Assembly symmetry: C3
């Protein structure tokens, strides 16, 4: 018979949605606001706000359909615009589907906000807008379809709870391609980081789709992995430089959050402590190797770390929820690696195409 | 049988309530804080905090009762002070009534915060406090009764989901009457605007009273109408001045949110995109013509109340008018509701300011 | 049969938890950030962030178990580390127990954040870290066990809904002992205060454990008591100094919130108005006589006392337990306050000293 929405789940997920919107408006905007040069802040805030608005529109017009509708292994469909095929009472899992639409839309928003906040007043605004349309449509959307919309990576049992590939790796490589082709308020950075943290609970727990024990797990693991990464990074920084800094504390937080994103509803809390530690160190490594586009280093490295570790610590003998029936750790790690690899290439190529199309049309300079 | 509270609804509504309190403390305070002259900030923040407190007290003493209790077409009652007739387990709709008390009390708070943040250190504080008491009691309270408490406008089938009349038009007119009778931190304005946005999800979806498909519709329409307005305003501003600004982006956001407030749980998402666009442009128009903040709440409030009477129609993607109601009749009711709201609040604001003027005077 | 989690309660309590984490990160950090000297902000924010992280780790390792597991009247146990005895589906009250772990963990975090934000760049960081480990383990944890974990004060029917003893008095005394042994952005203070306020709805209503009428009561009483304290303080300050200030408005808010913390799900809304007024004035008195600790301490004591009066049904509260008189209940409230003060005074002393003798408390 018909799916019926559970009101507790509706409630949960609307609030989670509002918490993820919070992480863009104003979370990410304040994070970049205190990182970039003061002469550029007003214009950065405006470009995050405007592209946020743009993403919201594109999402309901066609983006939700092309990401989550029936299609092939790579794309959904645009058979219906503006949510027209979706009755107001339609249910997806245990919530009204409209709530699923907003929740997933808020994901596209933070993902784009991440990129846009770094590239603002480096590439011309015109060129950001063309990049956003191209890359959302042809990278974000299909990669979401592949991982969460029944496409290719989902059909091979890829594990990515809340978006190590779809959000983090995806965006990291778009930013780095953009960076290749080209701090004044630290309390403001702390504030953004803090907002990003609180919001991420909606991100990570809400990705369970219901207020059940998987969301609880995801919640607890977020707390733990973030804390362990803060300490991971901070100890690494004390060692490497003799003093620990506020920006190091914040970066570590971000590193654990990223690292735990793919893993959070699949692993045990011991797992999460380990993932956090490693992610915190790997992120300190990443930036040290490599300019606000260091942010992409952390999303990228820690995204890869977290997608790998999900394939280990999901195992029931390590405290995780368990692999799917008949799956071995070695097989699963192979699928995690293939998923990472495909995500990197796909987004590299699409980012390239988007930037060039912008360059040849309006140019990338100010 | 007895009404039974649904715990999911309770949960939803307590979180929505906290989100709407958020939009006053600190949302609206930070929004005005970066708009007004620096020499006036500390005193503005204090007055918003104090009057917020005052509203909370008046609300539980008599305000909730006079707004939502059985009365007239215009007022409820004050038969019981301090929620005394309300058992702890009493249920209103699908939630404990105490939650309905806090939710609606947070609405009075943001409404007043709106007015107070603009009038701080223009009219003396004494006079703000007299104005607040008079106008909350005699404008906010009866207009809420008329629209959401079974009074006059609700009995004619007026559509106003979350307060285009009650909050926006009502407050716009009080502010403008106050303005007639008399920008240093733009990142702070962004922050306030952002908090106002996040909170507004509690405002708008919470006005459904339950975590159902109407709250979901309200949620999605808020996302969409805000985004469309941001763009609406921003494209208008690029045209009119050659450059788009951060303050324009934020104003657009506010315009869509105001515009979608009355409409949000009655219209379809296509409707919401249209409303947002128009509300964004109408708000850019409003300020350009011209406490500009009141221009936007007022013009966009009127825009949204009108458009609710169109796009609520099933053939336009809305939830549908009540049985036997035509679009033309419904538009007529929307207009009557707007008209009555403007006069009622204009007259009561006048009375409140004068009473303050004649008692303490309206400066230093 | 087995306890089954109610999903609405899960949802409610995960959100409440996030709201309490919010009060530390960034709430308390911004509150202290605008109070302390500018030269010290960056380092204060770092120390709050790091000790927050530390508390989260210690909590899941052993702290939750030692606070809420079966033990004696004072401590739980550490029979299992890292939540190992807790199945993912285990239920505590009407929620998954993992949610209870996070909710109570976020309490330990704000309690510590309160202390750490005041002592940062006064006492060396080394010494803060030793103090935190000692005092969380030996003061926060057993006092939570005693009040909410079935220990001594709970078995005598002590009333403390959301932590007038456990959080406020406990932390006040640790801070004052620390202060004895040793404002540049007022809008930032307002912001922190506002975040602390919003977060406190999760603190206070969430302490009911479920989205029911007790959480509703707790919610409403938080609105009302905070408002009444704002006014209480502000009228007191106008009188005492001729002008009311933004910092006074914020301090009053904090005073009503502290005051109403123990009382909030036991008293009626008339009770809450009175508690707020008194707490606002008692806090203005306290500071007038690390002033932050004065307010948490006085208003914590005020609230724990008033809980024992206004919980009475004849005053609009939910009622004392069967056979309990107001006089008996006040006696218990006093005994609880007294024990909390001495216990945390003694443990704070031990912690600071151990730090002093190991690293300095200076530089
Ligand atoms: C708005 C334009 C943005 C859309 C443009 C972006 C897409 C670019 C890449 C092309 C691949 C997309 C794609 O596969 O999209 C689908 C078509 O619609 C579209 O959305 C095609 C797009 C039109 C293709 O599958 P279909 O035959 O419906 O179902 C196949 C099923 O096996 C049999 O049912
Ligand atoms: C500070 C107090 C607010 C002062 C402002 C009060 C308003 C003054 C002008 C409008 C009067 C209110 C009003 O119109 O009327 C209300 C009563 O008002 C009061 O309780 C009396 C007034 C409430 C006080 C409703 O009438 P009631 O006879 O109780 O209902 C009985 C029956 O259900 C309907 O027939
Ligand atoms: C300030 C310096 C001086 C001190 C003043 C203190 C402040 C005033 C408050 C003082 C006392 C509270 C009143 C007593 C109630 C407490 C007992 C209580 O809980 O309730 C008392 C009851 C009467 O007994 P009951 O229980 O029915 O019989 C039981 C049984 O049936 C038997 O048969 O009702 C009232 O007294 C309600 C009185 C309402 C007062 C109006 C206030 C504001 C109106 C609008 C205007 C808004 C406010 C304007 C003024 C601030």
């Amino acid at each position: 018979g018909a799916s019926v929405a559970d009101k507790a789940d509706n409630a949960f997920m609307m609030i989670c949605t509002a918490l993820v919107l919070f992480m863009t408006i104003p979370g990410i905007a304040l994070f970049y606001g205190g990182l970039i040069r003061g002469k550029n802040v007003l214009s950065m805030l405006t470009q995050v706000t405007v592209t946020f608005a743009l993403v919201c529109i594109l999402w309901v017009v066609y983006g939700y359909s092309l990401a989550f509708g029936e299609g092939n292994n790579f794309f959904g469909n645009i058979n219906w615009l503006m949510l027209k095929n979706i009755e107001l009472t339609a249910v997806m899992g245990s919530i009204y589907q409209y709530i699923h639409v907003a929740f997933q839309g808020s994901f596209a928003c933070i993902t784009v906000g991440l990129i846009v906040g770094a590239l603002a007043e480096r590439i011309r605004f015109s060129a950001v807008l063309i990049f956003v349309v191209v890359w959302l449509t042809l990278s974000y959307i299909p990669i979401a379809h592949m991982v969460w919309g029944g496409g290719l990576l989902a059909s091979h049992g890829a594990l990515d709870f809340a978006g190590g590939t779809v959000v983090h790796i995806n965006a990291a490589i778009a930013g780095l391609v953009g960076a290749y082709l080209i701090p004044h308020n630290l309390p403001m950075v702390f504030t953004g980081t803090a907002i990003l943290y609180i919001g991420w609970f909606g991100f990570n727990a809400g990705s369970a789709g219901t207020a059940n024990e998987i969301a609880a797990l995801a919640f607890v693991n977020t707390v733990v992995a973030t804390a362990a990464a803060i300490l991971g990074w901070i100890f690494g920084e004390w060692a490497l430089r003799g003093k620990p800094s506020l920006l190091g504390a914040c970066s570590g937080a971000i590193a654990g959050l990223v690292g735990v994103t793919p893993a959070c509803g699949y692993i045990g809390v011991g797992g999460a402590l380990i993932i956090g530690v490693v992610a915190g160190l790997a992120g300190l490594w990443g930036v040290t190797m490599l300019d606000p586009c260091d942010v992409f280093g952390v999303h990228g490295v820690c995204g890869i770390v977290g997608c790998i570790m999900t394939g280990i610590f999901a195992a029931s003998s390590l405290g995780g929820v368990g692999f799917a029936e008949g799956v071995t750790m070695g097989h699963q790690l192979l699928v995690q690696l293939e998923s990472i690899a495909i995500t990197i290439v796909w987004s590299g190529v699409v980012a390239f195409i988007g930037y060039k199309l912008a360059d040849l049309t309006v140019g990338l300079r100010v």
